[PDB]
Structure formats: structure tokens, C-alpha cells
Amino acid sequence: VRRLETIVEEERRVVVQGYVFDAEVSELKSGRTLLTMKITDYTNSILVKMFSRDKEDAELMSGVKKGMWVKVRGSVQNDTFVRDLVIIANDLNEIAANERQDTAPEGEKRVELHLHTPMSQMDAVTSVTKLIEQAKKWGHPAIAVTDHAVVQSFPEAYSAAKKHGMKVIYGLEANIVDDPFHVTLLAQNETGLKNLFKLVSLSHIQYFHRVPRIPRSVLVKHRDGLLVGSGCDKGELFDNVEDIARFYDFLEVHPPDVYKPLVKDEEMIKNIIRSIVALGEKLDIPVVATGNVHYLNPEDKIYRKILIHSQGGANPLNRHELPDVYFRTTNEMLDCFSFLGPEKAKEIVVDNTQKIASLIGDVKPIKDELYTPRIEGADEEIREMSYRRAKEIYGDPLPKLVEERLEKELKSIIGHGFAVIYLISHKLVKKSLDDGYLVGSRGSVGSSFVATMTEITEVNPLPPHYVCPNCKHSEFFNDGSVGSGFDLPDKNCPRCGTKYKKDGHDIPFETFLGFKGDKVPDIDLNFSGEYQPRAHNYTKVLFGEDNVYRAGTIGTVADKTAYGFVKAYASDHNLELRGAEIDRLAAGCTGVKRTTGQHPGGIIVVPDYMEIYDFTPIQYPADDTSSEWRTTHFDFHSIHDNLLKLDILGHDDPTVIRMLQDLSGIDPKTIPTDDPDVMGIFSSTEPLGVTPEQIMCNVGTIGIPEFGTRFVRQMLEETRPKTFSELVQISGLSHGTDVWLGNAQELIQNGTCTLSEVIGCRDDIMVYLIYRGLEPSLAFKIMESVRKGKGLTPEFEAEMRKHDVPEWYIDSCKKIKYMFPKAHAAAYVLMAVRIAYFKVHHPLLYYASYFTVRAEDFDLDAMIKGSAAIRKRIEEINAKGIQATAKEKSLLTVLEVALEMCERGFSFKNIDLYRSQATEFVIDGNSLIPPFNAIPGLGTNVAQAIVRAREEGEFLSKEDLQQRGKLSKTLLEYLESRGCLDSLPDHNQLSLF
DNA sequence: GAGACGGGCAACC
DNA sequence: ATAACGGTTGCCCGTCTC
Ligand SMILES: Nc1nc2c(ncn2[C@H]2C[C@H](O)[C@@H](COP(=O)(O)OP(=O)(O)OP(=O)(O)O)O2)c(=O)[nH]1
Ligand SMILES: [Mn+2]
Ligand SMILES: [Mn+2]
Ligand SMILES: [Mn+2]
Ligand SMILES: [Zn+2]
DSSP states (O other), X not given: OBOGGGOOSOEEEEEEEEEEEEEEXXXXXXXXXXXXXXXXXXXXXXXXXXXXXXXXXXXXXXXXXXXXXXXXXXXXXXXXXXXXXXXXXXXXXXXXXXXXXXXXXXXXXXXXXXXXXXXXXXXXXXXXXHHHHHHHHHTOXXXXXXXXXXXXXXXXXXXXXXXXXXXEEEEEEEEEEOOOEEEEEEEOSHHHHHHHHHHXXXXXXXXXXXXXXXXXXXXXXXXXXXXXXXXXXXBTXXXXXXXHXXXXXXXXXXXXXXXXXXXXXXXXXXXXXXXXXXXXXXXXXXXEEXXXXXXXXXXXXXXXXHHHHTTGGGSSXXXXXOOOOXXXXXXXXXXXXXXXXXXXXXXXXXXXXXXXXXTOOOOOSXXXXXXXXXXXTHHHHHHHHXXXXXHHHHOSSOOHHHHHHHHHHHHHHHHTTOHHHHHHHXXXXXXXXXXXXXXXXXXXXXXXXXXXXXXXXXXXXXXXXXXXXXXXXXXXXXXXXXXXXXXXXXXXXXXXXXXXXXXXXXXXXXXXXXXXXXXXOOXXXXXXXXXXXXXXXXXXXXXXXXXXXXXXXXXXXXXXXXXXXXXXXXXXXXXOOOHHHHHHHHHHHTTOEEEEEEEXXXXXXXXXXXXXXXXXXXXXXXXXXXXXXXXXXXXXXXXXXXXXXXEEEEESHHHHHHHHHHHHOOOGGGOOTTOHXXXXXXXXXXXXXXXXXXXXXXXXXXXXXXXXXXXXXXXXXXXXXXXXHHHHHHHHHTSSTTSIIIIIHHXXXXXXXXXXXXXXXXXXXXXXXXXXXXXXXXHHHHHHHHHTTOOOOXXXXXXXXXXXXXXXXXXXXXXXXXXXXXXXXXXXXXXXXHHHHHHHHSHHHHHXXXXXXXXXXXXXXXXXXXXXXXXXXXXXXXXXXXXXXXXXXXXXXXXXXHHHHHHTTOEXXXXXXXXXOSSOOXXXXXXXXXXXXGSTTOOHHHHHHHHHHHHHXXXXXXHHHHHHTTOOHHHHHHHHHTTTTTTSOSSXXXXXX
């Protein structure tokens, strides 16, 4: 039975063992089945192949799963396609994992009080879940989490705690300075927990030096509910007579192996530990044998070695070798300390360890309920705001329909505590417009007519209808025959004679708040990217400085980074590893925390009767002490259910269409949603006056948000939508894995249902299930499950069958990995059609706005040369297929629209010293003049400088241009070589003040 | 050795 | 071409320059 690291050449016959971390099965022309596994025994890894000799073995083959352990007998061969050695197995048997066992008697078990999770930045490696589970298996009555300077594992620890019925001790290894050493803080109770959240806050904010730290006095102020331990060899006392020590509730000692970095010798460690045993007995302080865990098993050590190594000589823990700091069993812990004799061993490994655990109560680090803000007037204001606005549109008294929608909507929004955020959202939007920036609608608030009446969304969710902007007469349609009011033919009010308005997308309110009202949604707004910061800052003014926080993110190592680390470590160490072994080393590094950052726009709101520390510590993103905002230490996900979020997001749509308006004078609200020439671009190139061959595309949506994509254009080719609601159906199925491909598309092509019967937004699932007779709350629960790609539970299936839901519909729900709410789809389409209006009727305005706002990757020389030059660049990139770099893909996207622009008759001029702007493509006759910042290397800063300079006074020489325009040599040549500078002398033979 | 700039990556909607 | 979810903010780190 051979260890994998000893498999080095081709060989007729080996027996080998390992954890299978990947396994796929496939059929061969012959009818034979092939099993392809990757296994590791943790000394190395290897790919295993097996060829079935009968259908019995073939299906057994399908039973081999990730997580099994397997013994394989077979031959070692060079596989020339996979480019590695590989086992061809003739024999396979599942075996027990037979893992490290904890052999001490029940109730006589150890407790781990000093332990690191992957949240100890780049420093520990085994998830807190695995660790907690291992503890349960071993029978430990408790386990502590004590990450460096942070508590970012608390949320996962709690979950695992509840799942596994394990008692977790919520801790912190902190940096203390005297007014820089390690102490262990264990929280006994909620007072202690809150103090931890406070400490981690102050250490990251008021007291961050090069590292978060806590002055000892600040610790004392916040000590209540904490037990304090002396911790590592980087601890205060280990680093040396007695007063220092009496400061602690328990005294830490690590297995001698842990201290092996060396002090003078190995005998000194053994004595020092004794000097600490002596100290603790003398002072009646419990002495505890803690392990300083950084990973589960002894061999998991390599993953840590790889991470740390990635940080260069800029770490100085690469100086010496790394200690064995895996999770030690109670019996093996006794062994490490046998040298103190059997009574002390048992005292400090178990009795005291258990005793400390027993001084710890049952703490819940994350709350169960939602805390909702209060601001006087809010409930009442939202009520009057919406009844008044509705009445002025729909008349007094209101139509029954409208009236019932308000009554039902308001009692829910108010009762579940959402009126405040509706109102704040209204104010955010209103300030943005006053400030000159329109706002794009988004997300599920559009399901709410109250949201519509409060101008928090442009989406009107009522059934399709006509309303008169004059006399205000209505006509609604519930036949369900009409998809959205936007599809209606223009029509005049059969009363006052005046031209009808059309609206209503028939969206159920419950997509937003559900039925119990026990879901916690947010409100999503698309502010322009230019403006987003300002909307953020306005919430400080509205709620008060200390009642909002930007959601913080935790940046972990994912696949691409892990592979990078592993390869570089291989390279540096002169290892040639098999593919399979690179994979598994990579997989061992993922999940480890690397940085912190900022949620892309969510502001978390603290009710005035609570405080942030009831929920999470706070800090600076990436520890930037100059940052304008403080972030939550926990991410939004961890506290999703406790506090409302305002998704104040950034987006190009609002900026693009704002510029389209500032350039044309046209009010985008007056743009028609059934202009045949505009809607034609969603299925043809006719409206654009160009040939498909001319622009390398069969439909007219190049550059249109969402619809200009290659995947989506193809969908459009085969679905040919003309209608607003048909476009809405496409929006829905063009977003999310397994919605269209291998699902809806197959269903239409099969004949099993029509394009309009396929599941195209999460709302349709709910509405259909209600129709089919299921209980609305359950129909809602099922909708929410599938749109998060959680599939269906056995109960859901049973309820569905019981009510005659066809087997294809059930199966289609199980596939969907993600899905829009209709209100998002309608918002986005509305925006897409407005822009389209410009693409058709004001082409050059459309392109100026495109290249100014959306584009960041250019081939200017190609673009200037024109059609043929662009086409050639495009073909160069097409040739690389899916092996194109993101950057090539970003480029391709913009070139596609450039070529279209040229074909439509327009063109690009060279950079122009006196007409080029800083960041905006300007219109000149039938051309765009590119801005300075389009030049590779020339960022926004210089661009603006060049413009500022020339406004101060013309350039008098290439040299004058160079100095006052702050241009590097390289960029000066860029302009030079293109003839931009020909009209100027190199330098001036005179200069005056 | 400080600061602009862009690529590559991760988180999130 | 194949298969294909689209679009946004933000952080780190290497490169090039003055
Ligand atoms: N294309 C795409 N769009 C997304 C994705 N996730 C979210 N969005 C867009 C569509 C969503 O309606 C909106 C996301 O906002 P949220 O995360 O707040 O979800 P939503 O509002 O749909 O549900 P909620 O009522 O808040 O639970 O932004 C995604 O994975 N792909
Ligand atoms: Mn330490
Ligand atoms: Mn430690
Ligand atoms: Mn939302
Ligand atoms: Zn009328």
C-alpha cells in the first residue's frame, strides 16, 4: 500500500489509498463507462481512471462521490492527453476514513480554548465548521473561537453550533499595548460579547496603528464578561516577575512542540512551561493547556505554508519553520505533557480546561429578529403621500382596484416596519433629481404601488390600463389577456377626448414582502456612478452620523488566487506537481480571508433605540483610517435579518440617459414604448439602416444594456420580441444560469409549451401556483426557493403534483439557478427602450454617450482608420474564442459598437489638441472627437490638467504643452507620432513671466 | 519612494 | 464557432515615470 508521494514513474502494479475530491462519469462509443476521479492521501494526489466491464460496475461507478475514501489497485501509466502520470485502476473499494480518534473517556474530555479559523487573515486554514464538527465527534464539551484581532467567524460558528449541538466559546486573540503582546479573550455572556464587539471596533478605529490594537486601559474598561488569558509565546508573561501574571483569569501553555522555533534549546521550553505551572498553583490561577490551532490535521500544515509563503520576506514568519498547530486530541494532549506527571497533565488538559468552559454561558452572537427604525411622522406621511399622488392620477374617489391596492399595501408596509425606508428612499430620489441626476429603478420594490406613488420606482404594478392625464378616467384589464399597459394601442379618453396614458405591469405586491410579512427585503435604487457617493452621504444627514454604516465585505482567497499561490510556491521550491495535486493544494487554500472591503452600495440602518454593537463591530474598509465611511465588521449576509439595508447602487444607465437628455433636450419620460422603429432593433438591423453582414450581427441591439451581449442577441434572433412585455419575458430568461439553455429553450423547441408559458420571472411561479390552487404563502415560499436556485423540497413537489402541476414545470423549477422579479425586468427594459430610442433617432448622441459613459477599452488607431481596421481587430479577437482575456472581451464589446457607428455613416477623428475634451467624446459634424483620457496611459487626471492648462492659456510649444499639461515623455510621443503636435515648435526661444 | 494607471480578482446587486 | 447571465463597486499589486 503506497503513499502517493512515492508514485513517481510508470509501473505495472500499485495499491493506493485516498480521499476522492473529484469524480465524474462518462460514456464511450463502445457503451463502456469511464470513471475519472482525483484522489489524495494528503502526501500527494493523482488522477485515477477506470473502464467498466459491465453495466453493474458502470452504475457502481456513478456511486463514487466527492467525500468518499477509496482503495485502488492498478497500474501507473503516462497519460499523454492529461500530461501527467495517472492510475488505471482495475480494482476499487470504498473504505472508512478511519480518522484521528479521541480516546479519552466520556466526560473526561478536553476543551480547546485557543483556536484560529480562516478569518485569521492568511494565517489559518480549516473552516470553523469543520473544526466545530471535529470537536463534537471527539466529544469535547465545548470549543473556543479566538481569531487574531477579529471575530469574523462568529456567524458561521453559531450556525455550526446550532447544527451540531456543540457549545461554542466566542473569543478573540487581541493586540494589547501598555499605556505589543497577545492575550486571549473569551466571552462569558452577552455583556462580554458586546464588549468584544466594542474592543474590535476601537482597535480598528480609534486605536489602529499598523495593526488593530488595544491599550491595556481600554481593555480594563471593557473587561466585564470576559475571561483573559496570557496566550502565546507572543504573550506578555511567557516573554520573561509575578504581577504581570495576576492580571489573568487563566494561564496559557502550549505543547512544547508548538514553541520549537528557537530561546536557546528544547529543555528551556519544558522548564518555562513548568515555571508557569508553578506560577499558577502559587497564585491560585487555573493553568490551561491550549493548542493554538491553525488547522484541523497535522498534514493540513502545507496549506498554511503556502499562504504565508505568498507574502515574501515581507512577512518574517518565513524566517524559521512553522510549528505543528493542528487540532490536538485530549489523549494526545496528555501525551505532550506527560513530563509534568499524570496528575498535572490531567489537571491542565481537562479539569481546568473544562472548568474555564463552565464559566462560560450560552451566548447568541447574532440576533433572531428584525429591528426597525422609527422617525416621527413616517407612517402617516407615507399614507398621505401615496393617497394624494394616486388621487391626482386616478381621481377622487379612487377606483375600487386602486383603493384596495393601497389599503392592503399600506397596512403591510407600515405594520412590518418599512415606512421609514420608503420615505428616506423618496428623499434620496428627490434630492438626486434636484441635484440634476435622474435615478434608475431596480429590484423588487417595483412590485409595490405604494412605492410607485412615492416616486421610489417608475414601475407601476397595477394591471394594464389606460388613464387620462386630463379628466383622469380609467380603464383596467384583468382578462390577463394583455401583458402590460405599455403594449396597449394609443387611445383617447372616450370622455374628455384627450390622449390616454398607458401603464401597469400586473405585478403582485407579495414578491416584495411575502404573505407573513416575515421576509426582509430592501429597497434598490440605481443612482448614477458619478452621483452615488452623494446619495450615500445624504443618509448621514437623514439618520444621523452614527445610525448608518456601509456594509463591509470580507475578501477571501478563491480559485484564481489559490492556483496562483500554489504554482508560485511550486516554482519557488522547484517542485513539478501533477495537475491533480496542484488542484488539491489549491482547494486547501480557498476560503481564507485576505482583505476587507466595501459592499457595492448598501447602507445599513440602525434604529435609534438600539446601537450598532447590538449587531456587529465596526471598522474601516481595508483599514483605511482616512475613509469617509465606517463599515460593519460582519458582512450584510451575516446580519441580513437584523437590520434594513438601503441598496444605493451605482449604474451607467441613468448617466447615459441623463447625457442623452442633456444633449437632445428630449425628456426621456415622453419616449414611446411601442415605437415600431425602435422596437424593431430587438429583432432586426432594418431600423438602423445597415446590413447584418455590414455589422456582423443579425439584430440591432449592439450597445443596448443587457440586450447587446452575444448570448442575448442570439436569444433575440430566435425569439424576435416586438412588444414591451415580450422584451420583459426575454429580460427574465436571459439572466441566470439554467434558465434558458437546457431549460426554457428546450421546452419551447420540444413543443411542450409556448414562449409565453415558460417561466420568465419569479412572480410567474407564485401567481401560477396560486391559480393552480396552492396556498398563497406556500406559492410564495416556492417562488423564493427557486429564484435563489434552491430547487424544490419533497414537500413542494408533493404540493405541486397534488394540484396538477405538470412534471415538466416541476422539473423546470429545479433547474433555475437564479431569477429576476418582474419589476426588475420592467425597470431595466424601460431604460433599454429609452436608450434604443436614441440609438435609432439620434445615432451620434447615442454613440457619444456610449463611448463617454460605458467604454474604457479602445483601439483608437483602428477606430480612427474606420470600418475595415475595426473589423480586422474584431476578427483577431473572435479567433481567440473563449480563450480571450477579459480585456480582449471588454475591447471587443466596444469595437463592435464602433464598427456599427462607422457603418451607419459616422467616424472618429484623431485626438485634437484644442477640440478634444478631458473625458467626453464630443460631436463634430458627423464625427466623434475622442477625449484625452481615451489615450492608453492618459488617465482622468492628466486629461483634466491638459484641459485646465489650455483654458489658462494656449500651448506655445510641445515643451509648454508638456510642462503645463503634466505629460510624461511617453504620452508626448503618443501625440507627436500621430501628428497632433505638428503645428507647434518643439520649444520657445523666449520666455517671459 | 511617491503617486498614477490598469489589470486581475472578489463581492455583490 | 463552441456556450453563454449582465453589470456594478472596490482592493491589491506590478509597472512605468519624475
Ligand atoms: N443579472 C443579475 N441581476 C441581479 C442578480 N442579483 C440581483 N440582480 C438585480 C436584479 C434584482 O432584482 C436586484 C437585486 O436586488 P436584491 O438582491 O435586493 O434582490 P431583489 O430586490 O430581487 O429581492 P429582495 O426583494 O430584495 O429579496 O438587482 C444576478 O445574479 N444577476
Ligand atoms: Mn499569539
Ligand atoms: Mn494564537
Ligand atoms: Mn431588493
Ligand atoms: Zn379624459
